[PDB]
Amino acid sequence: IFKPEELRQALMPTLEALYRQDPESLPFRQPVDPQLLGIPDYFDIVKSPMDLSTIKRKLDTGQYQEPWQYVDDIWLMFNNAWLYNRKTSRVYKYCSKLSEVFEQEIDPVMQSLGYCCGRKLEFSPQTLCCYGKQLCTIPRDATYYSYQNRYHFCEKCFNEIQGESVSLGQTTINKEQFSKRKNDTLDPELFVECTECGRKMHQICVLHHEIIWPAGFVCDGCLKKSARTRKENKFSAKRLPSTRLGTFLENRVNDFLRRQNHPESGEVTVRVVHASDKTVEVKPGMKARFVDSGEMAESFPYRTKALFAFEEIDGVDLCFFGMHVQEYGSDCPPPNQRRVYISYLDSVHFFRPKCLRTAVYHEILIGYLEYVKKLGYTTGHIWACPPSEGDDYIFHCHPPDQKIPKPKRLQEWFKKMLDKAVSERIVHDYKDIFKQATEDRLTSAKELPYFEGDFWPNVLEESIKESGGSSQKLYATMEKHKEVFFVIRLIAGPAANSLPPIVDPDPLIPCDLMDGRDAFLTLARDKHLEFSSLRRAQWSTMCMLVELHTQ
Numbered sequence: 001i002f003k004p005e006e007l008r009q010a011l012m013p014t015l016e017a018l019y020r021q022d023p024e025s026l027p028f029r030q031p032v033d034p035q036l037l038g039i040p041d042y043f044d045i046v047k048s049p050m051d052l053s054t055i056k057r058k059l060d061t062g063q064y065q066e067p068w069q070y071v072d073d074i075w076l077m078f079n080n081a082w083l084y085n086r087k088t089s090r091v092y093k094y095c096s097k098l099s100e101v102f103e104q105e106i107d108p109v110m111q112s113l114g115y116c117c118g119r120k121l122e123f124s125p126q127t128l129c130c131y132g133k134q135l136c137t138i139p140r141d142a143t144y145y146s147y148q149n150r151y152h153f154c155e156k157c158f159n160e161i162q163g164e165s166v167s168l169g170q171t172t173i174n175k176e177q178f179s180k181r182k183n184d185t186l187d188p189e190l191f192v193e194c195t196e197c198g199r200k201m202h203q204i205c206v207l208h209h210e211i212i213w214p215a216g217f218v219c220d221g222c223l224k225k226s227a228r229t230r231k232e233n234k235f236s237a238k239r240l241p242s243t244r245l246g247t248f249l250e251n252r253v254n255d256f257l258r259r260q261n262h263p264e265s266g267e268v269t270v271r272v273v274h275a276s277d278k279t280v281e282v283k284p285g286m287k288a289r290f291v292d293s294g295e296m297a298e299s300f301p302y303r304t305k306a307l308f309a310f311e312e313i314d315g316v317d318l319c320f321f322g323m324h325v326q327e328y329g330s331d332c333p334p335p336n337q338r339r340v341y342i343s344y345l346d347s348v349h350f351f352r353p354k355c356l357r358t359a360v361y362h363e364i365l366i367g368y369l370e371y372v373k374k375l376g377y378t379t380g381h382i383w384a385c386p387p388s389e390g391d392d393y394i395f396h397c398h399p400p401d402q403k404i405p406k407p408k409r410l411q412e413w414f415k416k417m418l419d420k421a422v423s424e425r426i427v428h429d430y431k432d433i434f435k436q437a438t439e440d441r442l443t444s445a446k447e448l449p450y451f452e453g454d455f456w457p458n459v460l461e462e463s464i465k466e467s468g469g470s471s472q473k474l475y476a477t478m479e480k481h482k483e484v485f486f487v488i489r490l491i492a493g494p495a496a497n498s499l500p501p502i503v504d505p506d507p508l509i510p511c512d513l514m515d516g517r518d519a520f521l522t523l524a525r526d527k528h529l530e531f532s533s534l535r536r537a538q539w540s541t542m543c544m545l546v547e548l549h550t551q
C-alpha cells in the first residue's frame, strides 16, 4: 500500500494528460447520461460505467490502494467506449487518441513506482478454423457461429447450407443451438506478486517460473536492497543432454562465429531433443498400384529427430531455430535406402548479431548434411515450401514483423546454402527433381523416394485416380514443380554402391512433446507460449526448457 498522496502525486499528471486533450477528452469527462445523450441502450451494453471525473475523485479521495487499480479503471473507460461506439464513429477515434496518450504517459510513471512496466498486455487472438470447409478461416472481430466452443462456422458458409440443421462429426444440430459471436476476445497477461514488497508484475516481464524458483517471486528491487541474486536456473538449454550430432553442429556454428569475430556475438547451443523409430505407410492408391503386386514395399522405416538451437540474449536462453528430419537407413528397402529428408524447419528472428543470422542457419544445415554423409547416407531431399498464411511450422505465433519468404526467395536461400556446401566439398552436387529423375533414367512412380508428409505421395494418389489407373504424367508433374524439389548428392557414383551398414552412435531419445511438430504447437497454443516478441519468446523458451527437462 502506497500513501494516497504518493499515488495522487505520481498518477494525477497522467490523468491531466488525458484531460488536456481537446476535443478528444470531452466525451469522457463526465459520467455518460444515457437519456440526455439520446442513447437508451447504453446500460444494456455497458455494465460498468467509468469516466475521468469518477477516476479523478477516487484518486483525490484515496480509493486506490495500488496503481494498477487506477490503470484498470482507465482501460475500463476506454474499452467501454470502444465497445459501445462504432469503429468509424467520433467517440471511438477520440478514445483511441486518449489511449495512445495514456500508454506513453503511464509506462515511465509505473516504472518510477518500482514496477516492471505500466503497459496493458494481452495475448494474440487464436485463428478460428471452420468445420464447413478444408482451410476456411474466421477473421478477427467479424461475426461467427459456434457450438460447444468446438464447432465454429464463418457467417458466409454457415448460411450457405440449405435448411436449419447442421451435421457435426454424424449428429444433427439446429442452427438455433449455435452461439452468434464476434472473434474479439483477448486474454490478458498474468501477474505475479513480489512476496516481499507485494508489487504485482507481469510474469513474462520478470520471467518467474514456479518450478525453477519454488520459494517464490522476489523482484529485482527487493533483491538488490539486500544485495541478493536469484538462484541459478538449472533448467537451461546447455544442461539438456548432449549428443554427437548436437555437439557436432554447435561446434561448427561456434567455430564459424569465432572466425567472424563480430562484436557482441554469443555462443550457440544445439540440442537434439527427440529421436525415435517410425514407419511411413504407402497410401491406398499407390498401395493398390504397386504394393499389392509386390513391386513396392508397403511401408518404410525411418528415424525421426528434432533439434533446436539456442542463444543467450540479455542473460536468458532464447530458442531461435528448430528442425525435424527423417532418416532412412541402410536396412530400409529401396527406393528410400540411405536417404534423409527435412520434414520442416523454422526460426524466430532474434538471433544476434543480425547480420550473421542467415549464415548461422546455413551452417546448421551444412553441418547436418556433412554429419549424415559421414554416417553413410548418400542423398538429401528438400521440399522448399513456405508456410501458408497463419500457419507455423514449429514455433507458435511468430513476430508480426518477421517476413515470410515466398517460394522463389526460399528456393534461392536453399541454393545459396547448397552452393556453400558444394564449395566445401560436402555436397557433391544437387539437381531439381526433374533433372535428377532424367539422370537416374527413372521410368516409374514406384522409383520415387516416399517420405512421410511429402508432396509426392499425395500428388501420386491424385494422379492415379485422375488417370483412372495411372506414371503417365510423372515427368510433366516433376517438370512443372521442379524448382521446389531439391535432390542433394552427398555420396556419388560407385562409392554409393559398396558402403558398410549405417550405424548411428547416438541413442534413441524418447520425448513425446517433440515427436513431430504437432505436440509442441499444441502445448504452446494451450499455454499462451508465443514467439511473437523478444520477451514472450524468452518466456516461451523458459517454459519449453522446463518441459523438456521434466518430461
Ligand SMILES: CC(C)(COP(=O)(O)OP(=O)(O)OC[C@H]1O[C@@H](n2cnc3c(N)ncnc32)[C@H](O)[C@@H]1OP(=O)(O)O)[C@@H](O)C(=O)NCCC(=O)NCCS
Residues within 6 Å of the ligand: 344, 345, 346, 347, 348, 357, 358, 361, 383, 384, 385, 386, 387, 393, 402, 403, 404, 405, 406, 409, 410, 413
Ligand atoms: C527459412 C528461414 C530460416 C530463413 O530466414 P533468413 O535466412 O533469416 O532470411 P529470409 O529468407 O527470411 O529473408 C531475408 C530478408 O528478406 C526479408 N524478406 C523475407 N521475405 C520477404 C518478403 N516476402 N518480402 C520482403 N522482404 C522479405 C527479410 O525481412 C530479410 O531482410 P533483412 O535483410 O533485414 O534480414 C526463415 O525465413 C524462416 O524460419 N521462415 C519461416 C519458415 C519457412 O519458410 N520454412 C521453410 C520450410 S522448407
Ligand SMILES: [Zn+2]
Residues within 6 Å of the ligand: 116, 117, 118, 119, 201, 202, 205
Ligand atoms: Zn510489465
Ligand SMILES: [Zn+2]
Residues within 6 Å of the ligand: 130, 132, 133, 136, 137, 153, 154, 157, 158
Ligand atoms: Zn467457412
Ligand SMILES: [Zn+2]
Residues within 6 Å of the ligand: 194, 195, 196, 197, 198, 199, 218, 219, 220, 221, 222
Ligand atoms: Zn519486491
Ligand SMILES: [Zn+2]
Residues within 6 Å of the ligand: 262, 353, 355
Ligand atoms: Zn554487423
